[PDB]
Design a protein that fits this description.
part of a larger assembly, 3 chains, about 525 residues, alpha/beta, 2-enoyl-CoA Hydratase, Chain A, domain 1, 2 domains, seven-stranded mixed beta sheet, 15 strands, elongated, binds magnesium ion, propionyl-CoA carboxylase activity (chain B), metal-binding (chain B), Propionyl-CoA carboxylase, beta subunit (chain B), acetyl-CoA carboxylase activity (chain B), metal ion binding (chain B)
């Protein structure tokens, strides 16, 4: 009756909505090792900064008994909060309301949230935890997903979009994640697949568990779909906060500056990383960490295509992206999977104004029929495109091998690198020095009384005389051959200059990158 | 590719829009058979590794197979005839067909049996100028069809499910094939004409483990990003994520037409009805009678094209014999379509 | 059943929608000195050039007996035609269907047509003939109007807008 009576009523309406699917569904969620949609936001956002919208939204479709139930928030919390003082748009699906199924209004809430993020120039964090389409709502469910995908696409390379998979993510639900920039998957509780095991069994006869089909580790290791693996919902929330700390709010901002390391020095022990034997590998991250601020490296997709390493670091407090061959895995070759991993990361970096720091130690591409037949040409070409297209600063350090097409692809001067440095261990050649001597000296070797001895001498003389870094440096392809202990100083100084780098690109709606 | 094309050479072709390969003489690979044999042990000929058929059929790298150099030269001339010189020009107008009529035998292409397929090119060719269709990548991912054609003399690109191959499912390879083509059409200002008849995504452990998620998303991204006119005709099935992907209204189509044979549903009618009526089927004194009653009823009442038309998701349900006339008129209106996109250096399409 | 059976069913559904509010409501329109929503279009546009869209749209609101009735086109014809060889977007309210009252779906059709006229850069012609808000649809009808007003404002000085 009175205003205060209406306030008491309002509070009751709200408390009922905040129950979600009810106490028993919440107990079940917690027994599954999962937090609630609201408990997740609580960890993710700065304390008391979350403002919910559309809390009172109710579904409208009446089909199949839907007119006889209330569905709180229609299964999704949407709003805006702060993370480390910066505004962020967030949604959090509630699995306790009809399996977190996407209805029409649920989807419209998420669409409204993405529209808003784009308009305000702020990042979007989606926490998914959903059985998929609410099939009782029919084509409206599909209409919903479709509109979400369109919003994700429009936002792509305008605001950073991060997805956490913290439960099921089945059917068309899987594509919004795919359209976002980074996917964090929670170990054991997260699963993602278009088609489930029972349909697969009915159609192909393949028998597989959900975890083996689409678990967090599968998508991190096999499919290349996910970028991080968190143990926990707690760990997934802290991961998202750390990741965002590297990124701008939108594509019209420089990235944030945080806790500058102002020292210029590279430790002496950087000389002890590369083995004396050029056939032996090492962990390239031991080089990365002796060059970046505080030794801090935030690795992206660490379980997938481990022959290439990518992640975020800082130089003098400023975000950089790292791309590096990993000689300890597949001798640091390029292939289909590494090409995909690196190319997409580089396009993200360029879209959000982050410099690209490349470390090169690669003999070429992985030989094999499956690589050829699986499209290494078109996949490999993505990396070349991605670097060529980038207008952000590109600094490349060649540590050891750089042979053939892979020399080119790994942020070479010819694709627009602003500075190329070579260690004295660098070995730049048009192809592997053995294969090159076999071609150049085909006549001398075949003519010889001892072709293997003759071949062996020519390979050595070729490595010495043609593959040393001073040939590329004599042409200006390598800007400087440097002492490895000078690496950090060079990178800092170059990056200072390159803060004001302006590069144009021809007008186009967009390009035609190979897919 | 009119000969060998080895090592780093291959990447320039990969960075261009279309690759024609000449049958017996063209070969393309990053690494040759000797190096593969020395490293992996695999014994393979140059033809089998990187011949023109291999790249047209398996690898997805090439778009045309010419029998010889003569044919490849003519093929190139014919492909250019559909294209503008640059992205600031409208595509060229050639040999206009201004008739409006779609032939009566368009009604005889779809089988009576919904479980049977047909060749979607028999529909395409009864709608486009003079029946002329210039197919792109015909040997690769044959469950989807793409190519060039003309409506009133003006270039259109075609994307069509092929129900005669793998039931017209979408998969990794078909997504890649169509998505890149769409992005090309968009960049060079060519309208996109889509024909829909698909039950969904190809199920399989290898599809999932192969990244069907990121690959399939490329097609959603491509249609969503496109600002050229998008006209879509639903011929028959359009289930689930696949309905959304195939030029749906929700990704910004300008016009969506449905034949009366169209069957639009959130998932397969069988699978949907099994879930929704799970209880009633298990409480009936004969489940398979009630389950079959309910499935037919679900199809009739919920999957017909009028539900989506009632929401405006389908602009019109039409007689199949009106298809050419609707497309022609939609495209006359859409010649002046202007649509803006957010300012960005570029997007971050899944790769 | 077959494709041709489904075409015949489609024709039944279209003839029914084309009744508007029925022969008696149509006769009353004519007695009042007024043409129907479709007769007006037939005079306005170059012959045979009109393409209707959203003919099969149906209202969603169930309030106050709305769940028991069918409302052809939800009371408005929308589409594109030609006038002297030039494309024009047209809407024409049908007074025979609940006094031409503006439901949510009716509003959504007009909004869609305005969006489209703007994007394609063609004039809009609105033929109004309506008692006002469909009262039974509540606030959704006001949402409907507001979105139309928003579309008129964005289109103002971009494409010409004529109302009858
Ligand atoms: Mg691929």
């Amino acid at each position: 009756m009175s205003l205060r009576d209406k306030i008491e009523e309002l509070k009751k309406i709200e408390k009922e909505i905040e129950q979600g699917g009810g106490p028993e569904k919440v107990e079940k969620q917690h027994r599954a090792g999962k937090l609630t949609a609201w408990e997740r936001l609580e960890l993710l956002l700065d304390p008391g900064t979350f403002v919910e919208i559309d809390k009172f939204v109710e579904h409208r479709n009446t089909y199949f008994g839907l007119d006889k139930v209330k569905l709180p928030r229609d299964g999704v919390i949407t709003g805006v909060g702060e993370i480390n003082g910066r505004k962020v748009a967030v949604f959090s699906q509630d699995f306790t309301v009809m399996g977190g199924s996407l209805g029409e209004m649920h989807a419209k809430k998420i669409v409204k949230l993405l529209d808003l993020a784009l308009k305000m120039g702020i990042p979007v964090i989606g926490i998914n935890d959903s059985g998929g389409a609410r099939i009782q709502e029919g084509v409206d469910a599909l209409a919903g997903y479709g509109e979400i995908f369109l919003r994700n696409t429009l936002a792509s390379g305008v605001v950073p979009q991060i997805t956490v998979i913290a439960g099921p993510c089945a059917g068309g639900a899987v594509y919004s994640p795919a359209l976002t920039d980074f996917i964090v998957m929670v170990d054991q509780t997260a699963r993602m697949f278009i088609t489930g095991p029972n349909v697969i069994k009915a159609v192909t006869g393949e028998e597989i568990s959900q975890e083996d089909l689409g678990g967090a580790m599968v998508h991190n290791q096999k499919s290349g779909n996910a970028h991080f693996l968190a143990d926990n919902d707690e760990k997934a929330m802290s991961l998202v906060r750390t990741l965002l700390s590297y990124l701008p709010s939108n594509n019209a901002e420089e990235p944030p500056v945080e806790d500058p390391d102002t020292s210029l020095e590279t430790p002496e022990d950087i000389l002890d990383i590369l083995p004396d034997n050029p056939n032996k590998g090492y962990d390239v991250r031991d080089v990365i960490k002796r060059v970046v601020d505080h030794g801090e490296f935030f690795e992206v997709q660490p379980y997938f295509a481990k022959n290439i390493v990518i992640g975020f670091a800082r130089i003098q407090g400023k975000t950089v992206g790292i791309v590096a061959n990993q000689p300890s895995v597949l001798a640091g070759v390029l292939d289909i999977d590494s090409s995909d991993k690196a190319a997409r990361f580089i396009r993200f970096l360029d879209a959000f104004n982050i410099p690209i720091l490349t470390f090169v130690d690669t003999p070429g591409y992985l030989p094999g029929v499956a690589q050829e037949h699986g499209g290494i040409i078109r996949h490999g070409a993505k990396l070349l495109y991605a670097y060529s297209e980038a207008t952000v600063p590109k600094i490349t350090v060649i540590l050891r091998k750089a042979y053939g097409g892979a020399y080119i692809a790994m942020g070479s001067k010819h694709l627009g690198a602003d500075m190329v440095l070579a260690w004295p261990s660098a070995e730049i050649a048009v192809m592997g020095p053995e294969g090159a001597a076999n071609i150049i000296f085909k006549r001398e070797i075949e003519a010889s009384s001892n072709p293997e001895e003759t071949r062996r001498k020519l390979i050595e003389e070729y490595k010495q005389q043609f593959a040393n870094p001073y040939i590329a440096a004599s042409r200006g392809y390598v800007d400087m051959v440097i002492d490895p202990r000078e690496t950090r100083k060079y990178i800092m100084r170059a990056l200072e200059v390159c803060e004001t780098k302006v590069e144009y690109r021809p007008k186009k709606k967009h390009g035609n990158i190979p897919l």
